Design a protein around this ligand. Structure first.
Ligand SMILES: CCCCCCCCCCCCCCCCCC(=O)OC[C@H](COP(=O)([O-])OCC(O)COP(=O)([O-])OC[C@@H](COC(=O)CCCCCCCCCCCCCCCCC)OC(=O)CCCCCCCCCCCCCCCCC)OC(=O)CCCCCCCCCCCCCCCCC
Ligand SMILES: CCCCCCCCCCCCCCCCCC(=O)OC[C@H](COP(=O)(O)OCCN)OC(=O)CCCCCCCCCCCCCCCCC
Ligand SMILES: CCCCCCCCCCCCCCCCCC(=O)OC[C@H](COP(=O)(O)OCCN)OC(=O)CCCCCCCCCCCCCCCCC
Ligand SMILES: CCCCCCCCCCCCCCCCCC(=O)OC[C@H](COP(=O)(O)OCCN)OC(=O)CCCCCCCCCCCCCCCCC
Ligand SMILES: CCCCCCCCCCCCCCCCCC(=O)OC[C@H](COP(=O)(O)OCCN)OC(=O)CCCCCCCCCCCCCCCCC
Ligand SMILES: CCCCCCCCCCCCCCCCCC(=O)OC[C@H](COP(=O)(O)OCCN)OC(=O)CCCCCCCCCCCCCCCCC
Ligand SMILES: CCCCCCCCCCCCCCCCCC(=O)OC[C@H](COP(=O)(O)OCCN)OC(=O)CCCCCCCCCCCCCCCCC
Ligand SMILES: CCCCCCCCCCCCCCCCCC(=O)OC[C@H](COP(=O)(O)OCCN)OC(=O)CCCCCCCCCCCCCCCCC
Ligand SMILES: CCCCCCCCCCCCCCCCCC(=O)OC[C@H](COP(=O)(O)OCCN)OC(=O)CCCCCCCCCCCCCCCCC
Ligand SMILES: CCCCCCCCCCC[C@H](O)CC(=O)SCCNC(=O)CCNC(=O)[C@H](O)C(C)(C)COP(=O)(O)O
Lengths: 606, 178, 123, 172, 62, 126, 95
């Protein structure tokens, strides 16, 4: 059905159209923000047409558009897969993007370079979708590196600020450590089984496939902020709030989760790596969640929640439940996008206050965002019959029913209670409290560009879990049979998580000094992984270059040995041979010596 | 940022600058307001007492144990304002603060528009060159006898003279270029 | 999480089953001519319905039905509800089996411990 | 001339027939009815008009056929003329024997997209061939450096023809 | 203090890693026996050799 | 707990005994150093704020830094111990380490290929 | 402390000049002297794509491959005409 193929190729052409308009002189004459917002809107509708096809018939398509090099045995070609993962994600991503660009127009209003900002956002979407629908992994690499570079360009939008520059260099470094893993997996699949195309890599099921998948797991940990190198996604919040929503919140981070689902036919074979990520996903879930409890920056708390939810997503991939992991990716995108832009509304409406400490009683001052915030908060806490509930409790009870690390099982559940706690922290401090913001009040959220997108995503946050769960193809053969406390565990832990936190928030109001526990600061400064591993490594990696590798072995030792020594050896030799009295007697005698030696040279060799 | 740094700090400015860090690091612990305003007038009490200690030695022994009490009772994420060093918007808008000596290489076409703008800019540049002599001379004639020298610069002290080394405190790129 | 673990990990595991080897004893033990499981679907039917290998359970047959009523009835994704209950039931009625088998292996292992001691007549 | 159904095979198609069981109207059928009119017909019209423009001055292009010259196996030693003609004849077949392997790389890829969830089984007509062809490509062209030459394949083989003669003799 | 930091961070890391080990030793698994797949554990469909039949693996009721 | 400065996480200004000093000698330096800075400050501030200037303010303190760091090194090199022992462990140490890392691997690989164990399956490239 | 009487005049005066600079920065009137479409970029791009997908890709071998369609028990195969046998009867009715 060409309608299907053409549609998958068409979304890319339509989104690329804003990019070249800015290359020509035409954008000055038309409005770039409005034009870009409309075309993503049309791209979402175009994406819907294949989505219905798949659902009606559940069929996939590998599209080989252009050949790039034969390179002898390994031919390289540009291929877009249209498997359930690719088209489901393509639709969810553009809806979020359509929401954010309209938010972007309101948020960055008064920025002198709005058009460039919108331009990079769509370039990000083009790389993100290429990363999504990539058959051969070389294209997956183009997407993997591609979102990394544009994140660097967009985290540090305001280049002047060194803090933004530091975060951008952070993000590239963590991504590049991840890139080493993908290169290793690529190289292993460029040798052994031989083609970077997924359709053939999957014929490596009954092989070792550990050297390679360990590489992809390493790539995922860097891209998805698992416990190892978890800090750049918190650091990424130095970016503009809309950038934080579409890339820090949904498309960029889920890329690591998406890669492993693409390669899970191979993942099911190796038991060792499955528990490895189950284990690290589990550690990141709580580690990030505990850090979020004391963080006093609204954007920071949401970002930690982005990492904690993906930690749960990592856990399901680790328990070899790929389809549900993808289901959470889609539902995760709707609500996290909402909460960020919700805080975008609060931060912009207030005098750019990004701290929960000075922000209060937004519920009465701004009901529209507060309503959106609590809708999102409950979805994050898996309120029954909301989008989180359809996918999240499936994952929870999956854990409660599988054979798993006891430590992983316990931490994931309390991680769920903490998600309720920090969710409670945000609404109590941000919304339900006496106002503490600066005295002059100038709040307006009436702008259509704020409401509309927030309104549209809110509709998605309310109904998406209903629609996606029923429509997707039956998969995974879930276990609905459980003792009732395990069946209802997700619901109860979420309930008491808020209950306990509400007790905490309530406690503070008293005139009695509590401050915080000794491990509280440990929590507030991010587990101290940032304070220690960011000051030692960059210090003992640069000291060795300047002091040891550059100046010691370079410069002096490699210049005194080869280039300089040969300089000296000769210099000294000329000094002895050319220091001559000039007297004839001396010189002549030397002629005598010569005659003698030559007489002998003949004599002995007679 | 405007005034110049004093060489050594007095006892007072060290005490009175703790009253700021302290009270401001007490409003991170006391997220609410009534709790804060309470727990803080209790802070002043601490500083209010031991105000009239005349025994310097003692005073510098209350100060040195105050700033250690504080270091161990500080909040890791203090509430630092949005636009101040260490903040969230610090130097955000600096990507738009071009340094104003760049409008001098504009093409005669660009400067063709925006006409009255450059008519006033050429006046100010006449002001700058018209006083560099009287300024530097002032800066020098008033070089106090060689000795302690601080970064403080003199005012005008005569009509028509422009308070010196002024071209970059005035003509500063605007804070929010937006 | 559960008590079963406590039995095995706390206390003694002698009589607690090892999940890795659930049918640890003779399959026929305890049953004269026990009937083996039966599959309604056809090795081909499944292969033509492209059921994921994992989903090829003894409930594969009620699944194919669901999938049928999900392709048919396309615009309406909320109407193949009876079919899902059925599949699920089939599976609940399978999970229970897998639970009955585990309990049976538990008890049988106990038989061994009882019998050993009984059979361990002093003299 | 799009493709030789036999060099790039393709299985016959079996499609379940439409069997709607809902009163609601399928949102796909309506759209297609449009695509077919506002997207296909317009294009279809142009395309034809292309091909008739082509068929007026229809031209042809052939496929050079290379006569087979003598192979290094038979080629004087030091005679740079003969060996040059014979290292090319091989470097040429180093490629013809490489696009063949490109096709098995491809024919398979399709047979695992066309048979998902069954690839483990239905698609084993080709993976048996991907080893019947890979075990051969490995046995004539693999150890060789980047300076692959017919003299070296002649030796890579003949180092092993000892083995298919020492091992055989050994079995005795 | 820096030491306090280095010790605490790594302590956490170690305790966690360890507890995860206590976990692998004592896992959590429901009272459910093994799942039963039809045919010979899908021998042929798991891509098994069509010609060589496998030792039948049978699963009985209850 | 007393804060404990490490080479990193150094002792803050407060909590630093030296800060709490009024010995007239100390104050003497603290007021002498501002002078050097004030002097240097009033040598940057009326040369950068000078109309009629096009030449490049030089910042010779940066030129003394680069010369000290790339062109005043070898003229101040004296080969001692702790410098040549450490100047050979750095150039030949890992360079010899990896050789026995790569030789052993390459030799393991070769043996296995020779004996017939390495699979080299579906590897048609190299 | 308190500003020094000679610094509350270098801030007195320089602030006065900054106020004039910012006034001068103000633009005079005229200062800037300068001297459905939806279908357009959805339909025009589309025709092209289709031209490309139905007359290059489709034509070339193995360029658009699709998972086999799903065939269930009792549903007819249009191309060949066969009717997939109905499956063995489900004996249980237990809900
Ligand atoms: C698959 C393919 C790979 C996909 C993944 C690629 C990696 C991921 C993207 C990395 C992008 C890196 C980057 O930052 O580049 C931005 C850079 C734009 O610069 P900028 O920083 O945004 O501009 C602001 C500056 O201040 C300058 O501002 P300005 O005032 O100059 O702005 C006006 C504008 C005016 O633009 C022009 O330059 C006009 C002249 C264009 C010259 C070529 C056409 C001339 C006419 C021919 C007839 O100037 C530019 O933005 C371009 C400057 C550089 C010109 C050359 C650009 C690269 C070649 C583009 C070839 C066509 C690509 C189409 C896609 O160039 C790009 O836009 C690259 C786009 C790459 C898209 C590839 C296709 C996407 C995947 C499709 C599937
Ligand atoms: C040659 C030796 C080295 C010499 C170096 C210096 C040479 C300078 C002077 C000569 C310049 C011209 C000669 C070199 C360029 C040759 C261009 C060319 O060969 O185009 C071929 C291309 C068709 O491609 P073809 O390979 O025939 O088809 C694939 C078949 N399987 O035809 C085309 O597609 C033309 C397309 C034009 C516009 C293409 C833009 C594509 C951009 C894609 C990349 C975008 C992202 C790039 C990221 C880069 C990051 C740094
Ligand atoms: C930052 C980039 C770092 C890149 C690191 C690259 C590491 C891979 C390349 C070096 C190792 C290659 C080993 C290839 C196989 C060698 C022959 C073999 O079959 O050994 C399997 C190997 C050792 O197994 P064995 O000695 O039996 O030990 C098991 C009991 N403890 O199995 C093992 O026990 C583990 C060691 C071999 C498997 C390595 C898998 C690659 C992933 C490494 C960590 C992630 C790197 C990124
Ligand atoms: C008894 C028989 C009952 C029969 C019906 C049973 C209940 C069926 C409920 C289905 C609800 C589906 C729905 O409302 O979709 C709204 C949509 C959901 O999310 P969506 O934007 O599609 O994002 C997912 C992208 N894959 O969200 C959107 O599309 C946002 C659209 C924004 C503009 C909407 C303007 C009108 C709003 C009207 C609300 C009423
Ligand atoms: C417990 C152990 C658990 C397992 C190990 C976990 C850690 C593994 C290594 C992770 C990477 C270590 C470096 C991470 C990047 C980094 O630290 O950069 C941050 C640095 C300072 O930024 P920061 O202080 O965070 O933010 C500013 C707040 N005002 O910003 C900087 O620009 C610092 C300088 C960066 C550029 C030079 C850095 C060295 C580059 C080469 C070496 C890279 C690291 C070593 C090789 C890779 C190791 C994985
Ligand atoms: C293996 C790698 C080998 C690399 C060899 C590099 C040789 C050249 C390195 C630099 C030599 C050089 O700079 O010569 C200088 C020397 C003294 O002359 P002058 O230049 O006035 O003093 C500068 C002292 N650095 O001038 C001399 O006294 C002669 C320097 C050597 C000239 C070539 C000698 C070749 C001898 C072959 C026997
Ligand atoms: C031949 C290539 C090597 C040339 C140098 C060989 C050694 C020459 C020598 O040692 O003469 C030293 C003499 C200066 O002596 P002095 O200043 O004491 O040096 C000691 C420094 N600690 O320097 C001199 O007196 C001038 C150079 C003396 C050697 C002249 C050539 C000697 C040739 C030896 C082989 C001759 C074969 C003749 C066959 C007929
Ligand atoms: C920075 C990221 C580091 C990532 C490291 C990932 C390591 C993965 C596991 C590699 C080591 C085990 C490989 C196991 C393969 C199968 C078993 C085997 O036989 O090894 C292959 C071969 C022989 O190794 P082995 O069995 O130990 O025999 C030694 C005999 N004397 O192996 C050999 O050829 C001998 C050497 C084996 C061990 C090599 C260790 C390499 C260490 C790399 C350090 C990287 C950092 C260097 C400094 C960077 C900063 C300056
Ligand atoms: C962005 C990075 C570059 C992507 C370029 C994709 C298109 C490349 C391409 O194939 O277009 C040129 C191609 C030339 O024809 P040819 O390649 O010979 O095809 C014959 C098939 N038997 O096709 C033609 O010239 C014939 C006319 C085609 C006109 C419409 C082309 C639309 C191509 C859409 C590709 C979308 C995918 C790439 C971008 C996402
Ligand atoms: C939460 C943060 C915890 C911080 C707790 C806090 O440190 C508790 C505390 O400082 S405990 C009282 C210390 N209080 C002094 O150290 C003042 C004594 N210093 C003098 O009395 C001077 O001699 C002077 C005459 C100049 C005072 O005059 P002035 O008030 O500076 O103007």
């Amino acid at each position: 059905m060409n309608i299907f193929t053409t549609s998958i190729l068409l979304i890319f052409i339509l989104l690329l159209s804003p990019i070249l308009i800015s290359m020509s002189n035409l954008i000055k004459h038309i409005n770039f923000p409005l034009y870009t917002t409309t075309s993503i809107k049309f791209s979402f509708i175009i994406s819907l047409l294949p989505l219905l096809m798949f659902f009606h018939n559940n069929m996939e398509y590998m599209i080989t558009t252009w050949h790039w090099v034969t390179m002898n045995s390994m031919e390289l070609k540009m291929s877009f897969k249209t498997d359930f993962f690719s088209i489901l994600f393509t639709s969810v991503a553009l809806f979020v993007t359509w929401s954010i660009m309209q938010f972007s127009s309101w948020y960055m209003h008064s920025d002198p370079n709005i058009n460039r900002f919108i331009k990079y956002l769509t370039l990000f979407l083009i790389t993100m979708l290429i990363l999504t629908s990539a058959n051969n992994m070389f294209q997956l690499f183009i997407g993997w590196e591609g979102v990394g570079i544009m994140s660097f360009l967009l985290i540090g939008w305001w280049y002047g600020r060194t803090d933004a520059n530091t975060a951008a260099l952070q993000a590239i470094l963590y991504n590049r450590i991840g890139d080493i893993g993908f290169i290793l997996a690529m190289v292993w699949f460029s040798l052994n089984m031989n083609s970077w195309e997924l359709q053939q890599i999957m014929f490596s099921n009954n092989n070792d496939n550990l050297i390679p998948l360990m590489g992809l797991l390493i790539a995922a940990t860097g891209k998805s902020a698992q416990f190892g190198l978890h800090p750049w996604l918190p650091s990424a919040m130095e970016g503009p709030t809309p950038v934080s929503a579409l890339l820090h919140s949904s498309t960029m981070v889920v890329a690591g989760i998406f890669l492993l689902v693409r390669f899970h036919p191979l993942t099911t074979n190796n038991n060792f790596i499955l528990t490895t990520m189950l284990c690290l996903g589990a550690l990141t879930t709580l580690f990030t969640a505990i850090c979020a409890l004391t963080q006093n920056d609204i954007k920071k708390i949401i970002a930690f929640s982005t990492s904690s939810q993906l930690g749960l997503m990592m856990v399901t991939l680790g328990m070899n439940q790929p389809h549900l992991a993808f289901l959470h990716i889609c539902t995760h995108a709707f609500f996290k996008a909402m909460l960020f832009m919700c805080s975008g509304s609060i931060i912009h409406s207030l005098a750019d206050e990004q701290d929960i400490r000075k922000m209060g009683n937004i519920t009465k001052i701004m009901p529209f965002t507060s309503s959106c915030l609590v809708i999102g908060s409950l979805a994050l806490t898996g309120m029954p019959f909301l989008t989180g509930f359809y996918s999240k409790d499936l994952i929870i009870e999956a854990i409660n029913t599988c054979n798993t690390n006891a430590w992983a099982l316990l931490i994931t559940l309390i991680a769920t209670s903490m998600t309720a706690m920090y969710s409670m922290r945000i609404i109590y401090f941000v919304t339900m409290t006496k106002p503490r913001f600066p005295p002059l009040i100038s709040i307006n959220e009436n702008d259509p560009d704020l409401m509309n997108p927030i309104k549209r995503l809110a509709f998605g946050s309310i109904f998406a879990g209903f629609v996606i769960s029923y429509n997707i193809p039956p998969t995974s053969i879930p276990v609905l049979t459980m003792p009732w406390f395990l069946k209802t565990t997700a619901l109860i832990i979420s309930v008491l998580g808020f209950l306990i936190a509400l007790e905490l928030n309530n406690l503070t109001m008293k005139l009695s000094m509590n401050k915080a526990n000794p491990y509280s600061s440990f929590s507030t400064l991010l587990g101290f992984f940032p304070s220690i591993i960011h000051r030692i490594t960059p210090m003992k990696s640069l000291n060795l270059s300047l002091k040891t590798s550059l100046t010691l072995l370079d410069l002096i030792w490699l210049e005194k040995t080869i280039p300089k020594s040969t300089s000296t050896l000769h210099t000294n030799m000329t000094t002895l041979t050319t220091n001559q009295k000039g007297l004839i007697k001396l010189y002549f005698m030397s002629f005598l010596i010569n005659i003698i030696l030559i007489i002998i040279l003949y004599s002995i060799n007679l | 940022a405007f005034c110049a740094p004093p060489a050594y700090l007095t006892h007072q400015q060290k005490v009175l600058r703790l009253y700021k860090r302290a009270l401001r690091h007490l409003e991170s612990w006391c997220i609410h307001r009534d709790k804060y305003r309470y727990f803080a007038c209790l802070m002043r009490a601490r500083f209010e007492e031991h105000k009239n200690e005349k025994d310097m030695m003692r005073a510098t022994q209350l100060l040195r144990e105050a700033e250690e009490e504080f270091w161990q009772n500080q909040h890791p994420q203090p509430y630092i304002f949005p636009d101040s060093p260490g903040g969230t918007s610090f130097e955000r808008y600096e990507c738009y603060k071009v340094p104003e000596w760049c409008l001098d290489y504009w093409h005669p076409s660009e400067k063709a528009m925006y006409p009255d703008y450059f008519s006033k800019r050429e006046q100010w540049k006449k002001l700058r060159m018209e006083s560099w002599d009287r300024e530097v001379k002032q800066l020098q004639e008033e070089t106090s006898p060689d000795g302690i020298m601080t970064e403080a610069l003199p005012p005008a002290r005569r009509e028509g003279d422009l308070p010196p080394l002024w071209w970059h405190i005035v003509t500063r790129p605007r804070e929010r270029p937006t | 999480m559960g008590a079963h673990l406590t039995r095995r990990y706390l206390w003694d595991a002698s009589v607690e089953p090892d999940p890795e080897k659930i049918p640890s004893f003779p399959p026929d033990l305890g049953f004269p001519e026990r009937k083996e499981r039966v599959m309604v679907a056809t090795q081909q039917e499944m292969m033509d319905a492209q059921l994921t290998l994992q989903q090829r359970d003894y409930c594969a047959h009620y699944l194919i039905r669901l999938l049928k009523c999900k392709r048919d009835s396309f615009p309406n994704f909320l109407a193949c509800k009876h079919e899902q209950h059925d599949w699920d039931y089939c599976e609940h009625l399978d999970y229970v089996k897998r639970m009955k088998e585990f309990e049976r292996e538990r008890r049988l292992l106990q038989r061994k411990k009882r019998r050993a001691l009984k059979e361990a007549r002093v003299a | 001339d799009s493709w030789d159904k036999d060099v790039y095979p393709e299985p016959p198609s079996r499609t379940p027939a439409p069997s709607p069981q809902t009163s609601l109207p399928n949102p796909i059928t309506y759209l297609t009815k449009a695509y077919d009119l506002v997207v296909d017909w317009p294009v279809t019209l142009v395309r034809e008009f292309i091909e008739r423009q082509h068929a007026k001055n229809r031209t042809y292009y052939y496929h050079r056929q290379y006569r087979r010259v003598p192979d290094i196996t038979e080629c004087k030693e030091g005679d740079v003329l003969c060996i040059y003609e014979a290292e090319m004849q091989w470097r040429r077949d180093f490629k013809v024997d490489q696009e063949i392997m490109n096709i098995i790389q491809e024919r398979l890829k399709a047979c695992q997209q066309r048979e998902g969830e069954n690839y483990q089984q239905n698609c084993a007509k080709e993976l048996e061939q991907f080893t019947k062809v890979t075990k051969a490509y490995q046995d004539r062209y693999l150890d060789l450096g980047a300076y692959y030459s017919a003299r070296k394949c002649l030796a890579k083989q003949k180092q092993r023809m000892l083995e298919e003669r020492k091992a055989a003799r050994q079995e005795a | 203090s820096w030491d306090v930091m280095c010790k605490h961070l790594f302590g956490f890391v170690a305790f966690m890693v360890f507890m995860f080990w206590v976990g692998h030793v004592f896992p959590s698994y429901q009272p459910v026996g093994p799942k039963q797949y039809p045919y010979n554990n899908l021998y042929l469909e798991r891509g098994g050799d069509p010609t060589k039949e496998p030792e039948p693996v049978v699963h009985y009721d209850i | 707990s007393k804060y404990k400065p490490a080479p990193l996480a150094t002792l803050p200004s407060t909590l630093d005994p030296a800060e709490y000093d009024v010995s007239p000698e100390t104050r003497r330096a603290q007021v002498e150093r501002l002078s050097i800075r004030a002097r240097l400050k009033r040598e940057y501030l009326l040369q950068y704020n000078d109309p009629k200037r096009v030449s490049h303010i030089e910042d010779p303190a940066l030129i003394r830094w680069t010369y000290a760091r790339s062109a005043n090194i070898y003229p101040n090199f004296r080969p001692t111990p702790k410098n040549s022992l450490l100047g050979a462990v750095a150039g030949f140490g890992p360079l010899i380490f990896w050789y026995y890392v790569f030789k052993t691997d390459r030799d393991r690989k070769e043996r296995l290929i020779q004996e017939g164990k390495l699979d080299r399956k579906f590897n048609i490239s190299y | 402390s308190g500003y020094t009487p000679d610094e509350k005049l270098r801030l007195q005066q320089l602030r006065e000049l900054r106020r004039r600079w910012l006034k001068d920065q103000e633009l005079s009137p005229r200062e800037p002297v300068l001297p459905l479409f939806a279908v357009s970029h959805v339909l025009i791009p589309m025709w092209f794509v289709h031209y490309y997908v139905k007359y290059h890709m489709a034509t070339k071998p193995y360029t658009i491959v699709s998972s086999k369609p799903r065939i269930f028990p009792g549903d007819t195969i249009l191309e060949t005409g066969e009717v997939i046998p109905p499956m063995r009867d489900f004996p249980d009715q237990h809900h």
